[PDB]
Amino acid sequence: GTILIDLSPDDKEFQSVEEEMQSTVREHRDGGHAGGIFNRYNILKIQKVCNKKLWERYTHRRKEVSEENHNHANERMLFHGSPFVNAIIHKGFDERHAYIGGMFGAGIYFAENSSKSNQYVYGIGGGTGCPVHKDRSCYICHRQLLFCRVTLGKSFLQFSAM
Amino acid sequence: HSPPGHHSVTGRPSVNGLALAEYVIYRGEQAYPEYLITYQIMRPE
Ligand SMILES: COc1cc2ncnc(N3CCC(CN4Cc5ccccc5N(c5ccc(F)c(C#N)c5)C4=O)CC3)c2cc1OC
Numbered sequence: 001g002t003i004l005i006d007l008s009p010d011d012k013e014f015q016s017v018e019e020e021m022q023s024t025v026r027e028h029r030d031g032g033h034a035g036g037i038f039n040r041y042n043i044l045k046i047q048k049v050c051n052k053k054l055w056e057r058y059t060h061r062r063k064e065v066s067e068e069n070h071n072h073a074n075e076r077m078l079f080h081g082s083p084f085v086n087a088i089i090h091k092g093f094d095e096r097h098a099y100i101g102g103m104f105g106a107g108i109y110f111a112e113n114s115s116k117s118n119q120y121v122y123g124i125g126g127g128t129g130c131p132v133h134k135d136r137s138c139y140i141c142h143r144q145l146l147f148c149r150v151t152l153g154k155s156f157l158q159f160s161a162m
Numbered sequence: 163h164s165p166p167g168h169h170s171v172t173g174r175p176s177v178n179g180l181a182l183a184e185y186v187i188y189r190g191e192q193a194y195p196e197y198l199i200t201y202q203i204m205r206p207e
């Protein structure tokens with residue numbers, strides 16, 4: 001059911017998504033071990049993910065959560081990195097593949113820093129890095145991130161020691 | 163599962179003052195994978 005629509009770099013949506021990617025890079029306390037050493041990206045392509053089934057399931061849940069939280073979905077746009085992005089765009093996020101090792105419970109993780117999500121694109125801790133060169137700092141291989149619409153509703157605030 | 167009467171968790175760094183939040187949801191229907199971004203990291207000059 002999914003179709004991918006290529007956005008022109010001249011498109012305001014391409015430009016605003018790029019700016020959120022670039023502007024949310026930070027340094028990491030691992031010195032670049034997991035995600036590599038960089039201050040910015042080379043954006044190669046931005047595709048809009050169009051799936052009527054997935055969108056309708058999202059908006060149905062968003063209305064349920066809104067109604068449970070004084071008409072407030074608390075909807076954010078957040079990055080997700082994992083080796084499973086090509087699965088997720090076809091079948092949606094699957095909570096049965098939840099991150100059990102995560103600091104905040106067994107669920108689906110998203111990040112405000114694009115560079116946090118970049119740490120996970122080749123797996124937990126960056127895994128063994130890119131498939132071709134086994135390099136977590138590969139400057140050659142193409143990476144993919146999702147920029148996602150996320151309903152937080154009433155969000156439990158867990159202060160992290162990070 | 164989310165904490166009772168919560169829909170998500172906000173993992174808010176309290177030590178690194180420049181680190182922004184992480185978020186966890188427990189139902190895949192609470193996210194839509196809206197944009198697929200293909201990129202390289204750039205080697206600093
Ligand atoms: C082909 O197999 C799969 C198909 C899938 N289809 C849909 N959804 C999937 N998952 C993807 C993994 C999600 C939980 N994880 C797992 C994970 C594995 C490896 C690297 C990172 C992650 N993260 C993750 C953890 C910390 C993070 F900060 C971020 C971000 N951004 C992402 C998850 O949220 C839950 C939803 C799938 C996961 C699959 O494999 C486990």
Ligand SMILES: [Zn+2]
Binds near residue numbers: 132134
């Ligand atoms: Zn590589």
